[PDB]
């Protein structure tokens, strides 16, 4: 009487919103980018090979100054690096050795990392003492934490395996807003440059964008047939790019409210561990788990280059804020740093 | 190279030394995975051997550090965190023998024993554990002997001979889990019947882990 009455109205709305997307889809992005020149072969060499890890690297985030970078590893060690001079800035002994994620604060003060322990421990780097201590042990999630991005020194958005994202307060140590929209385990996060919105893809093959002010699911994107593992924003904050296990990266647009491009090649059938953008956004760096990274072209869906220096599968790759170098971290315990050569 | 830069390298060398030493200690300790239903006697083994999220238990038996990860508390999909556990020595896999007639709580169409075998089929035939051996424990040996006389094993299996004694039925249950293993040359199942004695359960783990380590060593050496 009511269960099937609402199940038919839900499928009607879903049908009603796909007709709107089709109607506003007169052209694709494959047609507005034919007249522009191609990117060419982006041959980026391995400038540095950050080593010292003895186990698999799960995540790495850059800094605001585009020099320091934080690495999360399986051995229970969170290492802050110096990309230029290749010397360890810090190496935090972690309480859990199954750290799935780590971010670096935009001010450089704190570093967060959570994993299978389901707590995103926020470490205070710039402290009065020598050692790096635990500011707060954020707890309240039921599943594994897959991302811990920073809005600022006081607010951290975290994605978890209990199908919920949560906007944490660092001072009080409690959730201020809990984003409960997915039916599958959430794997990614990506903060917008204006820090108001954030999209996060889950294992239900859907990427939802949540506002941090109101706290509800602004939009919902579909199209993938497998689990979305990594999303990053185009540097406007108007488009994100997903990475699934079907070897397809899609370029969903927020104002058009649908997919623009499909970054997929025939020879690759493997998963997409990490996605990233350049400063301009022309190059879409996607980290495939067939041991190498493909330098996709965002506007043309052309494989401009291949970062093929890693023996085991690349897990997290990030590009600096100035866009200088892309550092890719694989499971062979090497954070190679890649940069173009003139 | 400035004095600030040289001292920063000197700090990194000190970080390198401690990080290498910690990795040496991490290599010495033996990681082993723990999968169970949660009510199937997994808890019983953890409390005996010691005397939300992951639970880590450290115990030393004979000149060796054992690290155990109790990952049954997470209700998420296994596919997106089982790849962390690729480098591991063994997988302790607790299955109660009393679960053959008891129905599963969530759906009750499938028995608890069949659900555990589905869990076993996923972990054994996983692409990440093509070389990692599995240690299987049959937890509720004491309860199973009393229950089998009252209720036969025929309710769980359409195809079964019908012996209805402990000696031959338990061996058949052991056979069923071993048959689910598709790859027999790379990984071997080590079945054990869990008893109340604390020393016996830990002794089997020490024996099996030592056996698995020798197989890894011999494969690397090349005698295999």
């Amino acid at each position, epitope marked *: 009487s009511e269960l099937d009455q609402l199940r038919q109205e839900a499928e009607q709305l879903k049908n009603q919103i796909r007709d709107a997307r089709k109607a506003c889809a007169d052209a694709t992005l494959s047609q507005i980018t034919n007249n522009i020149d191609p990117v060419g072969r982006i041959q980026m060499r391995t400038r540095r090979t950050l080593r010292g890890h003895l186990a698999k690297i799960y995540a790495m985030h850059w800094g605001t100054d585009s020099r320091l970078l934080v690495s999360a590893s399986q051995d229970g060690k969170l290492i802050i690096w110096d990309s230029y001079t290749t010397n360890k800035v810090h190496a935090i002994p972690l309480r859990s050795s199954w750290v799935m994620t780590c971010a670096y604060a935009p001010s450089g003060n704190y570093v967060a990392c959570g994993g299978l322990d389901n707590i995103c421990s926020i470490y205070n780097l710039k402290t*009065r003492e020598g050692n790096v201590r635990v500011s707060r042990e954020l707890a309240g999630h039921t599943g594994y934490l897959s991302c811990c991005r920073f809005l600022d020194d006081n607010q951290i958005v975290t994605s978890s395996g209990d199908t919920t994202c949560a906007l944490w307060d660092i001072e009080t140590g409690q959730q201020t807003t809990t984003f409960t929209g997915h039916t599958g385990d959430v794997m990614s996060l990506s903060l917008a440059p204006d820090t108001r919105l954030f999209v996060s893809g889950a294992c239900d093959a859907s990427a939802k964008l949540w506002d941090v002010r109101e706290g509800m699911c602004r939009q919902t994107f579909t199209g993938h047939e497998s689990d979305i593992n990594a999303i990053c924003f185009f540097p406007n904050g108007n488009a994100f790019a997903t990475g699934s296990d079907d070897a397809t990266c899609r370029l969903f647009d927020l104002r058009a409210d649908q997919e623009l491009m499909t970054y997929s090649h025939d020879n690759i059938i493997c998963g997409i561990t990490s996605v990233s953008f350049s400063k301009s956004g022309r190059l879409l760096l996607a980290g495939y788990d067939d041991f190498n990274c493909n330098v996709w072209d965002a506007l043309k869906a052309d494989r401009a280059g291949v970062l093929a220096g890693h023996d085991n599968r690349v897990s997290c790759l990030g590009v600096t804020d100035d866009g200088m170098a892309v550092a890719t971290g694989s499971w062979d315990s090497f954070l190679k740093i890649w940069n173009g050569s003139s | 190279l400035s*004095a600030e830069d040289k001292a920063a390298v000197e*700090r990194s060398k000190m970080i390198d030394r401690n990080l290498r030493e910690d990795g040496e200690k991490a290599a010495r300790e033996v990681k082993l995975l723990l999968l169970g239903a949660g009510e199937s006697g997994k808890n019983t083994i953890v409390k005996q051997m010691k005397i939300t999220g992951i639970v880590e238990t450290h115990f030393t038996f004979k000149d060796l550090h054992f690290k155990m990860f109790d990952v049954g508390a997470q209700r998420s999909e296994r596919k997106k965190w089982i790849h962390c556990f690729e480098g591991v020595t063994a997988i302790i896999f607790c299955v109660a023998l009393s679960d053959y007639d008891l129905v599963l709580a969530e759906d009750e169409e499938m028995n608890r024993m069949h659900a555990s075998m589905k869990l076993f089929d996923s972990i054994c035939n996983n692409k990440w554990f093509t070389d990692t051996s599995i240690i299987l424990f049959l937890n509720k040996k004491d309860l199973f002997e009393e229950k089998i006389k009252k209720s036969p094993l025929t309710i769980c299996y359409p195809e079964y001979a019908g012996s209805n004694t402990y000696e031959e039925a338990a061996a058949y249950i052991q056979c069923q889990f071993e048959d689910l293993n598709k790859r027999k040359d790379t990984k071997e199942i080590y079945t054990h019947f869990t008893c109340s004695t604390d020393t016996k359960n830990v002794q089997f783990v020490f024996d099996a882990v030592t056996d698995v380590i020798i197989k890894n060593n011999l494969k690397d050496c090349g005698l295999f």
Partner: single-chain antibody, 233 residues
Framework: DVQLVESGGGLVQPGGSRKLSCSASGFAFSSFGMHWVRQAPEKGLEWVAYISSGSGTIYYADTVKGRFTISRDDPKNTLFLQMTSLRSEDTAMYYC??????????????WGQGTTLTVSSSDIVMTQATSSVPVTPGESVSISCRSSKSLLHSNGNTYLYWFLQRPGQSPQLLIYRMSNLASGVPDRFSGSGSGTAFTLTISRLEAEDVGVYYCMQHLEYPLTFGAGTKLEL
């Protein structure tokens, strides 16, 4: 918070052996690189010795080379300076200084209280233009410091450090690497300059800004303090 209190000295015949013990509490002593700096009565500071973290690289000054040995014990968190063959020149106040070294680090940030050892009876020459300037609180004062060698290194940052020493108090870091500010200093202090002739500009003086301003170079050892500008309210 953090506290360095060093004891030992005060009555030593010339040629004697006095061992200075610096007891460190409240911080991770093993991480920091310890410094001993000496200050003669009504004279500028001089750098004595540095030990890195882990006792890897130990630097001495030219005047104290071969006579003084610096040792640190990491579990007891104690810094030991053994002083042998003392001269008339060695009457000074020795400060136990802790320094950290990484990108964005603030070395020479915390300073010991100091102990007085009195006795009975080439490198970058850091000079400063004036020695004492009478100024009033509330106006902008510019203290200059001219280096003999260009402190700008190839990596990009110039290693000049500003230290404020109050009358009867220990020195403190307030500007490190000529542009950045230490932890606890207000934003009224601003360091500028380019290449060699570096300068420090205070926006507004207060009662807690009176003291002596030094300008240590840190491009290469030995570390050279300039003859400080005394300020009188």
């Amino acid at each position: 918070d953090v506290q360095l209190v060093e004891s030992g000295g005060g009555l030593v015949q010339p040629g004697g052996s006095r061992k200075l013990s610096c007891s460190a509490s409240g911080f991770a002593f093993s991480s920091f690189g310890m410094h001993w700096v000496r200050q003669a009565p009504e004279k500028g500071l001089e750098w004595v010795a540095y030990i890195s973290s882990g006792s890897g690289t130990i630097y001495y000054a030219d005047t104290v080379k071969g006579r003084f040995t610096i040792s640190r014990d990491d579990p007891k968190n104690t810094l030991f300076l053994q002083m042998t063959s003392l001269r008339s020149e060695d009457t000074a106040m020795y400060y136990c200084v802790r320094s950290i070294y990484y990108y964005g680090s603030s070395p020479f940030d915390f300073w010991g209280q100091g102990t007085t050892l009195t006795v009975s009876s080439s490198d970058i020459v850091m000079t400063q233009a004036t020695s004492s300037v009478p100024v009033t609180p509330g106006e902008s004062v510019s203290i200059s410091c001219r280096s003999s060698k260009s402190l700008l290194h190839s990596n990009g940052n110039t290693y000049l450090y500003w230290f404020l020493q109050r009358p009867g108090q220990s020195p403190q870091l307030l500007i490190y690497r000529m542009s950045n500010l230490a932890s606890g200093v207000p934003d009224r202090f601003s360091g500028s300059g380019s290449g060699t002739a570096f300068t420090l500009t205070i926006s507004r003086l207060e009662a807690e800004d009176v003291g002596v301003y030094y300008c240590m170079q840190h491009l290469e050892y030995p570390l050279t303090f300039g003859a400080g500008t005394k300020l009188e309210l």
